[PDB]
Amino acid sequence: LTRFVAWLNGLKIVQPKIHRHSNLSDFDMILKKAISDCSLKESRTCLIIDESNILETAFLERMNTLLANADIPDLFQGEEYDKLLNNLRNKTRSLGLLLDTEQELYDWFVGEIAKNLHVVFTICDPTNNKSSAMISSPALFNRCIINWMGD
Amino acid sequence: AVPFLLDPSSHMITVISNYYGNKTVLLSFLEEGFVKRLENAIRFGSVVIIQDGEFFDPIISRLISREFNHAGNRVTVEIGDHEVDVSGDFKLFIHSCDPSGDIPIFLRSRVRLVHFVTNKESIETRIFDITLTEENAEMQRKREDLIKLN
Amino acid sequence: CLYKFDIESEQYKEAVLTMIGVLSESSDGVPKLTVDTNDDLRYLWDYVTTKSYISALNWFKNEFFVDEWNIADVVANSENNYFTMASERDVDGTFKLIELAKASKESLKIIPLGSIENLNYAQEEISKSKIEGGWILLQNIQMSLSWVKTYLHKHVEETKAAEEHEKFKMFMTCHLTGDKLPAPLLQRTDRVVYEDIPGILDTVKDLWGSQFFTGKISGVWSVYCTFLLSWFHALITARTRLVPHGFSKKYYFNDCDFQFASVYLENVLATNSTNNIPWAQVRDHIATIVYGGKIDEEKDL
Amino acid sequence: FVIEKSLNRIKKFWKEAQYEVIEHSSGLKLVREWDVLEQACKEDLEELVSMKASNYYKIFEQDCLDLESKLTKLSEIQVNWVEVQFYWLDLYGILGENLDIQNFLPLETSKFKSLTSEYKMITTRAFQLDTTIEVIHIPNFDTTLKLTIDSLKMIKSSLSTFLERQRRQFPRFYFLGNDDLLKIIGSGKHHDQVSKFMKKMFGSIESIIFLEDFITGVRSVEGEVLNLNEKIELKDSIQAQEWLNILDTEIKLSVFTQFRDCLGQLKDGTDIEVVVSKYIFQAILLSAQVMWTELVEKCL
Amino acid sequence: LKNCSTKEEARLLWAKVQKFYQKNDTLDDLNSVFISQSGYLLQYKFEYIGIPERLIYTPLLLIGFATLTDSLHQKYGGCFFGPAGTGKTETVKAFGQNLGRVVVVFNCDDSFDYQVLSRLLVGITQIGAWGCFDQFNRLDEKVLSAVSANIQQIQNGLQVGKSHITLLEEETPLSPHTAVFITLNPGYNGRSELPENLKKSFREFSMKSPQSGTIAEMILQIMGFEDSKSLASKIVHFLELLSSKCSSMNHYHFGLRTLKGVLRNCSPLISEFGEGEKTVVESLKRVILPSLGDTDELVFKDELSKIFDSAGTPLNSKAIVQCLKDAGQRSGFSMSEEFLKKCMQFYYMQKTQQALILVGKAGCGKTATWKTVIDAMAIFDGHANVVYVIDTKVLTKESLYGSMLKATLEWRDGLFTSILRRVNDDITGTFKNSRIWVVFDSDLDPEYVEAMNSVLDDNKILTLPNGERLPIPPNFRILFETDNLDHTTPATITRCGLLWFSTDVCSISSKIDHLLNKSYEALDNKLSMFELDKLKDLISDSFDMASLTNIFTCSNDLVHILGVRTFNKLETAVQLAVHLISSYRQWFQNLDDKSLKDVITLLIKRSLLYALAGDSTGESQRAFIQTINTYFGHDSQELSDYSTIVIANDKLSFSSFCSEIPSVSLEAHEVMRPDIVIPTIDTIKHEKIFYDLLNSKRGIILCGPPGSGKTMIMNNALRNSSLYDVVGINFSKDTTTEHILSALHRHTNYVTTSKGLTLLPKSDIKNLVLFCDEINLPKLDKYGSQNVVLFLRQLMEKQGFWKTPENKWVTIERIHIVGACNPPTDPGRIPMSERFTRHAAILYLGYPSGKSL
């Protein structure tokens, strides 16, 4: 149903392709690609997370930083920060605006993420601790709308 | 749907091997080349039996849940990032040893579970069998051949 | 209980239950006194009230009225070439095994599992004796557990032709309080527990009987000293089995402690005069190095 | 069917096979990251094998059989070449550097260099082909590497037997190990670099004092100085094992000498304050113990 | 032997003692000397031993030697099992020393390979030396099995006497002079045992902690005996009587470890007085007293004078106290009796102890205590001091002690070792004469102190995980500041000196005056000196303390959310009031004492309210307002719920009117905006107090349920002003410090300015403010201490932090800590340590009446 409604609103459905041999680096790469497509390519993506997709707690910390803040400072830092800034100025001039300071570009990037990235969670049983952590987090709970389809 | 077999002793894995002969290809979710061997076995209709069902990687999800992208003559399925073709002659079984180990809820939901375990009620059944064998052997004898000859 | 609760009435059930609570510290309830309705239960309560516990516990064994099978009876009835008889470190069923072999089908072979030498010799004699058909024993197998999980685990499993081989029987000695053995290998073989406890006088005589096989290496006084040591070791080994009263914990004194004691005795006999006064130190040493070396509690020391 | 779609990508991948090459200190150039290419080779071989259970490949096979016959020999050379790489890189840090270690072992290095030249030839010729698969067309590559790893194993076996028999001659070397034993065999011409390892292979002494010609004695990790009766002479016609064993005996001899001197001194009624200033602690300790036990034996 | 009753007793006692005989009858000199014990003989080999510290001769040591020789006469291996600290390995070493052998020890499982062990075993079988396995029980099943097999091969070849034996699948010869020994530490179940194969090749010997009397008498005989027997008896009786009367405390340790420590402390004190009982008394009063509580200090004094009374007046009584006074008058603290007592205890312990521990309630002045004592030691001797304060649990064990990388095996310094080479490796400046002090502020746990147990030992040498042992000089002292000792080991306590802060150091007014003077100095950079003099005179006239006493007493009769004890709140009061006074000090001032005083008193009352009851329900704040109005002067201006001072902008006016609200109007498209807020009667109030607390530069904690306006109020109070720029971080169940660091690099820019060797300011010029939402959610270590909170504490108290990768200090510039959280009673919330909330102001924000909504 999430996929159906996202296809109705014209959203690019993004389901993480994870497995047992999946590293936090691959999760970071998928989040990076989704964010860069929603900002630098204006894709308007819908990210569907499931309870079996959170292998470790660091994944949940990444998601918290993605919801509470509209960006993930850990993904883009150092050299990747500079590359992202360059491509960001590229796209910003493409859209017909020049931003003066270094913070204005990142503010526009943050707004674009906030307005193009839609996250939908698909947890199964809240009685499970790994699933209870999904609701216990303040970021996910307060920034998401809760829907119940238990039985 | 896919079947899941739970026998402590893996007698059943050899039974399946015997039914399928050389087409039988044995894998396990733990081994290294698994990720790739499966991608090969699915492309050429090899009956696969995954040895350790306790551990399970969701990249096989799109295969367990019947999700496929249709074309003119080929039917593909996404595994990891590679879209591999489905044969049709392909079969898939999952096998586990210990009921102690818990499989993810998604798998247990999408898969048909079967217990090939010998419990304490099997005693209650087989002692009846033996008791009727050694008490009234003639009727126990004709029991089997009744259904057989039916 | 499983049998009588279902068969007999519920009065019987509650009566034997309150009696078993009496034998435990659960409660001391009033029993049901029905004359000639149940005289076996009245007999049990007569056992319980006179404060004699061992007979009361044996009452449940005498209420199944079965001829309890001896180790020999089970070996005779059992048709398997693999036996494991565990036993507490107090005793070892080795000599029982000797007497069970000599009485019928003598072919007795003992194998210590010590050095790599011993293990190679053992794995040779195993594959040779299963073909020849003689009784083989593997002493205190636990000490080479790492070798069992690699060799014996394969060997016994593969040897479904040992049942095909000649009439032969392999034994293995374990220790209940010790390293764990693999459950499958333990289930394949037959299992026993050697619980034959010798008396104090019997242990004294069994220790004194093996000492005159040495011939005559020491003087005449050394004989008296060896007698004293035999009695002492028998007494300590008897006190070892009472672990609440007597000794605080359960300690184990092997024949090696006896050996060290006797060696110290021969040494002090050679070095000191034939006067009987050195006794003073004989105690000290023996009470703090030979035997007392293992004790860590002041009470038992 | 899909057989063609797979064979196309396989050939595409293998006509793009590149090896990361970087040259170390001396002329040879090492190859980096073996596991990627080797694992890809094995994966494609297993895929080609699994292609045999299909039904739409009988006539489409011969090509795949030629591909299999090529890749099997590719992996054949893969294993031996990587083994040669590893064993040569290991023996290099042992023989390719020191002059003294090759002076002690002239034969094994005479063979090592003869192998290294041919290995340079092979490696450069294989890298300049610009296709990792085409290497299997280079003549005498599998046999070259087979006998090269055989020679490396033989060199390493000679080395290991030499080292273990050297240890067996002077057993203290068992305490040190390979690297420090090699350093000792190498600095034998200097004789003064050895002191640093006696602290390990003796535990008691720290260093050894020299006259450059003789050995006046040693000094311990504590600070006490022990002087030997017979200072052992050092010449170039001397092995480490040799003078080390002679010293191992002479130290116990000197301990006994100082012990007997101290005991004979104190037995003649000399104060301990005089003996402390000249005798080591161990000699005077044992002497005091002996005289004490004797005097108390008579006092009893 | 003299005191023996009969000759039989003498010969009995003599057969036990080792007897070093000599054979004047035969040749083979190296085989001439032998030793007799209990009837058995052992040949003396002439391996050089040096001068290693000899164990003190006790009867238990002789019994251990007897068991070893009884085992060796039959060619049986030696083995003891016993608790850690009995020195069983030391017993093996000493037994090998007496017989002239250098026993090689095998520290097993300490990253110990099996190939090296096999090499050592072949070498020791060939040489004929003695091998000892230290704590043989710690091994992996594989390694333990293989080593047991080989050890049994050896002992079997010995018992039988075979010339060559086969072990490791290797036919090697055997020297009959070889011997094996095994020390077994108790595990979790109890006393471990040998594998079943060795139990028939070794002789297990039990070990008990020797009775303290004998070892005490022997050690006293060593140090200088005067009255060894009587002194040992009195010390043992005194320690037993202390354990008898003193209260049952967790950190109290009067066992044999404590008395060995007392004797090791007596050793350097003998150089000061002499080998008398007075030295024993002084050692006891240096070690035991600082560790005891007020209730037990008098017990100690009483029992001491009861068993033995020695002196009345101590040495170094006049100079040290005056130096401490001169250091404190400059630091800003007062010289009470408790502060003076604990400073003197610390000074009398730093002499002997190289490792010190300071335990007490959060913010007990411990910090001030040791800082002042070090500052005064700088004056007494003239030796400078080099201090490194490291928050223990902030960094991991890899960044602190040292991290070796997996692949390249690159051994990297870390922090603790990177500051130890500045004293050992390169002493280019003045380090041989200075005093190096390394303080540990955060909670200490066993996992961290075990890596440096070799430094707390008598070794005084830091063992690297691989490669080196770095010696520490006597100038290098280690201190441990914390609040609890629930996790540490009594062994770790008995290796260091312990200082127990029973209660708070001084009273309230002294700290208040200290804070006032510090605030005066903080304002002295701005405004003029004459103004400062006028302000100090006015403040001296203003309050005395008699009014504040009852207010502070009544503050305890209130409900405080996110509880902080009254003492630690003082720093939050003074500073805010001082700032307010300065802001009203110039440009808009009056000259009427009645009115001028009214303004000062009203500002002070506002600051007092928000400091004491700022964390209360708000419904209780309105009652504390009247309490303040009560215990203050009756003619001074009272305080109202929404009191406010009004003054004209360009002209000089004076009045006080309250509750003035502007009108806001927004169209339809402005309904939902991340930066939209409707000012209410409590919006501008909360914003004003928040802005004044931020102007005070102090840390801020906003406690309350979600959506109560914490986020909203904090955001819209600073998005309006240009002085501060906000960066928002949202904590979760497990947030690292690196998460904060990464969220900061975007808005921060490192600079290397000479004022602070490495500075980490904001990328622009104006102030930066970090908002850490849900600050009490991050989880703690398995010992119960959260590292991110300790990192924020280091940021707020130390104003800096240690680089996690590069290993050096960085001072932060113009960065303030603000953080929101929920009450700790809610599920999922973690209680925070007071040591962090001490430096912060707590403001409670609830839901507005259900009517303002």
From Swiss-Prot, chain E:
Subunit structure: The dynein complex consists of at least two heavy chains and a number of intermediate and light chains. Interacts with DYN3.
Chain's role: Cytoplasmic dynein acts as a motor for the intracellular retrograde motility of vesicles and organelles along microtubules. Dynein has ATPase activity; the force-producing power stroke is thought to occur on release of ADP. Required to maintain uniform nuclear distribution in hyphae. May play an important role in the proper orientation of the mitotic spindle into the budding daughter cell yeast. Probably required for normal progression of the cell cycle.
Protein's UniProt name: Dynein heavy chain, cytoplasmic
Part of the intact protein present: 1715 to 2567 of 4092
Compartment list: Cytoplasm, Cytoskeleton
Region described as AAA 2: spans on this chain: 322-559
Annotated spans, AAA 1: 44-265
Domain notes: Dynein heavy chains probably consist of an N-terminal stem (which binds cargo and interacts with other dynein components), and the head or motor domain. The motor contains six tandemly-linked AAA domains in the head, which form a ring. A stalk-like structure (formed by two of the coiled coil domains) protrudes between AAA 4 and AAA 5 and terminates in a microtubule-binding site. A seventh domain may also contribute to this ring; it is not clear whether the N-terminus or the C-terminus forms this extra domain.
Record region (AAA 3): 665-853
Residues that bind ATP: 82-89, 360-367, 704-711
Other observations noted: Present with 195 molecules/cell in log phase SD medium.
UniProt superkingdom: Eukaryota
Lineage of the organism: Eukaryota, Fungi, Dikarya, Ascomycota, Saccharomycotina
Family statement: Belongs to the dynein heavy chain family.
Disulphide-bonded residues: none
